[PDB]
Amino acid sequence: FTVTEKGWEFVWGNHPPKRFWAQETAPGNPHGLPHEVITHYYHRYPMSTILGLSICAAIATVSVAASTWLFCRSRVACLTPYRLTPNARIPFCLAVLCCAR
Amino acid sequence: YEHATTMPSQAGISYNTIVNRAGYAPLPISITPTKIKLIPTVNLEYVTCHYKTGMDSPAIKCCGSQECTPTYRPDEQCKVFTGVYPFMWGGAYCFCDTENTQVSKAYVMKSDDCLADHAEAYKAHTASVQAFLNITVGEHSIVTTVYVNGETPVNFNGVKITAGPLSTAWTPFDRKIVQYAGEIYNYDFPEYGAGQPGAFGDIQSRTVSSSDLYANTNLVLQRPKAGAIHVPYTQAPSGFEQWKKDKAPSLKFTAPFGCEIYTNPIRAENCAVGSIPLAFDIPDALFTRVSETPTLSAAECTLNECVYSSDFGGIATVKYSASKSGKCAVHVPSGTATLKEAAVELTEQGSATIHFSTANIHPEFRLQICTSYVTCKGDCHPPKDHIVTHPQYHAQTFTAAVSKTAWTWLTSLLGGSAVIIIIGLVLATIVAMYVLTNQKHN
Amino acid sequence: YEHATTMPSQAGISYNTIVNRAGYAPLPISITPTKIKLIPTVNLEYVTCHYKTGMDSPAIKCCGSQECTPTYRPDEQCKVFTGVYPFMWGGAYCFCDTENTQVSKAYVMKSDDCLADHAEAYKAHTASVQAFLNITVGEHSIVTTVYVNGETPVNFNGVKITAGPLSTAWTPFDRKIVQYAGEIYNYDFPEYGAGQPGAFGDIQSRTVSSSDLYANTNLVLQRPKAGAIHVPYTQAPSGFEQWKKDKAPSLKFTAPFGCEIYTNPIRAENCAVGSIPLAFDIPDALFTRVSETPTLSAAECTLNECVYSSDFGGIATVKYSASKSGKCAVHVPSGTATLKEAAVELTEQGSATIHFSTANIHPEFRLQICTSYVTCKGDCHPPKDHIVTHPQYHAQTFTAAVSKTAWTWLTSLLGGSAVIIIIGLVLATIVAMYVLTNQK
């Protein structure tokens, strides 16, 4: 049987009722090695963990993608006025920073 | 002094609080609920039992013809049979071959054991909650049956307490109830006069001694065997016995929230649902002044034991200094820790050892002792039992067990991405301004 | 066979209807409510009565001192007075000048006439309407108490009738009720233990013989007169007497909808509110074939007299030619006019007289005699009494008393304007076409 924190009770024949109560001793260690905290909060709070990891992965993916997008647009906006000149003498500091030729 | 609070609807567990008048001594209040009933308004309709087909002796006339004289007994069948040559032990009964006549007459009456073996069909609605509180307000304790409608006060020592109505109108009992043998069932019994043959209520006596019972038991008289004096019938079996053979289990074993159904008043017990609000009309005489109670100076709190078990598995230790030796209240204003005792008796330079209960992994609460606030901080550890035989003595706060390591993983992988996007936005702004500065040249 | 109908909740006035099975004989139904009760669930909280301040005899110690011994009696006071010089008829009692001591003890107890003179404070909720009907279904007539919840059927001759619940949860009673001497009051009494002196419920005994009463009567002990053995006291006067002096009138005088408050149990009777739905479960054996009943040919209805009064003030004569002599149903389908009787016995060539009742100045209602349908048409006249002592036997149809002349005035003033505006619009269209023709 599955016993939660809200209680559980059985009666075995002519015996009196036995009530039981679950308490929060989940397998894992919540203090380090971050694949151990995820199993701990998965056996502890199963529904909330998948939603939390989904929204944290989504925000991390959107943030890394938008930062790469803005950095590549700013590199293009820097190097384009020095790549339309027919001599193309890009200076040295922008060559080291913007990773030019 | 009007003080309102709220108590959870759960027996056995002591509920503690204090009242802080802004310039006086704190007044501790303790309420421990013992037995919380729920008594519906119960309305008897009918009882039922086993029936007992009574049969009159066969009226026999030799070379004659009988008639059917009714009696208006319940389900009273009667029929007249012709062409009968009955026998007694001392030979034949008539001399006529044909044109003899035997009358069968049967009726339904209720059984002889109806008094001690019957089932009561009721109707219930609009229950009434009633608790056995054990209140202590300023070391003056009473034990009184309070009623928990929004009125009907309990009065003691000038203090008026009105424990208001439950936050939920839930009852375990349905609109219809059958009581049999000390146990109570949610059965949809048919109405009086609607009793069907072969099922519950084929007999419907209005009370136990009503002497007017409705009976619909599918009784049909049959023709007697040639040469015998008997009354043969054929009816559907006892619907009360067939109800007893099926009998989906009692409400004692099936009730939600763990109720405890009892019999002699039909009532439920200790249904852990809802919450009782409270009103305290406290007179001004009980508020003792400040300087008639001890008051600490230079106190400090440390945690000896800290286990986030179900009961009082934490010990905080307070080293204090105060220039009196008396008792004073302790309380935790948040629901972070649930203390065990409500008062601590003090020396002038000793230490205090309190017992609290908590769900937190890193407990940081602000203990209120006599009139001051210390901060008790530590780290709790998981308990050793998976399953205990007592309920919970604390409240699971949302974000209670978040374990500072995981606070660090949520701060870095979610706040650091914001740092990435703001330095990307700053870099984009500087690039746009530098492009506009380069095209200022013409 | 399910036949659903709805009866107005009003005692005494008969209700008649018929079941029109499509190929069988019409089946008459006649239901006359006699007494419509309305019973709330009623819960006793306490009783109250006049009180009686009990006094103890004064305990005098000659040149000593006394103490207070509590007897825990209700509202009990015990003050002890020093410096007394009491007296009997045989001279002085003590012989000292000072330092004598007298103990006064007073307490409240409920009166000796509590059993036959007291107010019972109840709580009411969740009424349960119950009705004494008188039901005739196809010359099977019973008289039987019904319970008008949506179940608990009444059974006679295989017919199963169930009176549905009221369309209104109205009760004349409030949440709190006081009974005093056959009369019932919506009165907001204080709770038990919440009684105040000088008002209702300063004395609160849980039952009549409870032997535990709550007394809050503002009893104060005073100091006795020099040279007198008595217990003086001051207290607020009796609130049951002051409540009898106030007593806004009973609920049988102030209740709406004509209700009649009685108390053998606490109930209202004959309130004219709401309406009872009915449910008929008619078996298939009561339906006689058509050919075993009379059936008419060439029937005609003429109105002899016609008064749009409140009682039956209209006489219609129906001349028929019957195939067979027997009683059959008469009924009006609409609420246009309400007949008096539910059945008419026929000869073979006679002329029948029916009594009806209408609010219409110009009634045109279609009667239903045995299986045919004649059209009764005529004109009614105003009655002569302004005020009658019996309620209304018919229904108030909207636009029932329009009095055909005013139909003509409304139709002229409402139709001539529409005629003028449509001929104006047609004239505008013709003028526009004539302009477009002339501009060629």
From Swiss-Prot, chain A:
Interacts with spike glycoprotein E1. Processing of the precursor of protein E3/E2 into E2 and E3 results in a heterodimer of the spike glycoproteins E2 and E1. Spike at virion surface are constituted of a trimer of E2-E1 heterodimers. Interacts with 6K protein. Interacts with host LDLRAD3 (via domain LDL-receptor class A 1); this interaction mediates viral entry to the host cell. 2 adjacent E2-E1 heterodimers in the trimeric spike interact with host LDLRAD3. The chain crosses the membrane at residues 50-70. This is Spike glycoprotein E2. It comes from the Viruses. It is a single-pass type I membrane protein. Palmitoylated via thioester bonds. These palmitoylations may induce disruption of the C-terminus transmembrane. This would result in the reorientation of E2 C-terminus from lumenal to cytoplasmic side. N-glycosylated. Residues 71-101 are cytoplasmic. Plays a role in viral attachment to target host cell, by binding to the cell receptor LDLRAD3. Synthesized as a p62 precursor which is processed by furin at the cell membrane just before virion budding, giving rise to E2-E1 heterodimer. The p62-E1 heterodimer is stable, whereas E2-E1 is unstable and dissociate at low pH. p62 is processed at the last step, presumably to avoid E1 fusion activation before its final export to cell surface. It is found in: Virion membrane; Host cell membrane. A lipid is attached at residues 78, 98-99 (S-palmitoyl cysteine). It comes from Venezuelan equine encephalitis virus (strain TC-83). The lineage of its organism: Viruses, Riboviria, Orthornavirae, Kitrinoviricota, Alsuviricetes.
UniProtKB/Swiss-Prot annotation, chain C:
It is a single-pass type I membrane protein. Disulfide bonds join 49-114, 62-94, 63-96, 68-78, 259-271, 301-376, 306-380, 328-370. This is Spike glycoprotein E1. Class II viral fusion protein. Fusion activity is inactive as long as E1 is bound to E2 in mature virion. After virus attachment to cell receptor LDLRAD3 and endocytosis, acidification of the endosome induce dissociation of E1/E2 heterodimer and concomitant trimerization of the E1 subunits. This E1 trimer is fusion active, and promotes release of viral nucleocapsid in cytoplasm after endosome and viral membrane fusion. Efficient fusion requires the presence of cholesterol and sphingolipid in the target membrane. Residues 84-101 are annotated as: E1 fusion peptide loop. Residues 434-440 are cytoplasmic. Interacts with spike glycoprotein E2. The precursor of protein E3/E2 and E1 form a heterodimer shortly after synthesis. Processing of the precursor of protein E3/E2 into E2 and E3 results in a heterodimer of the spike glycoproteins E2 and E1. Spike at virion surface are constituted of three E2-E1 heterodimers. After target cell attachment and endocytosis, E1 change conformation to form homotrimers. Interacts with 6K protein. Interacts (via fusion peptide loop) with host LDLRAD3 (via domain LDL-receptor class A 1); this interaction mediates viral entry to the host cell. Signal peptide: none annotated. It is found in: Virion membrane; Host cell membrane. Glycans are attached at residue 134. Residues 5-412 are extracellular. N-glycosylated. The chain crosses the membrane at residues 413-433.
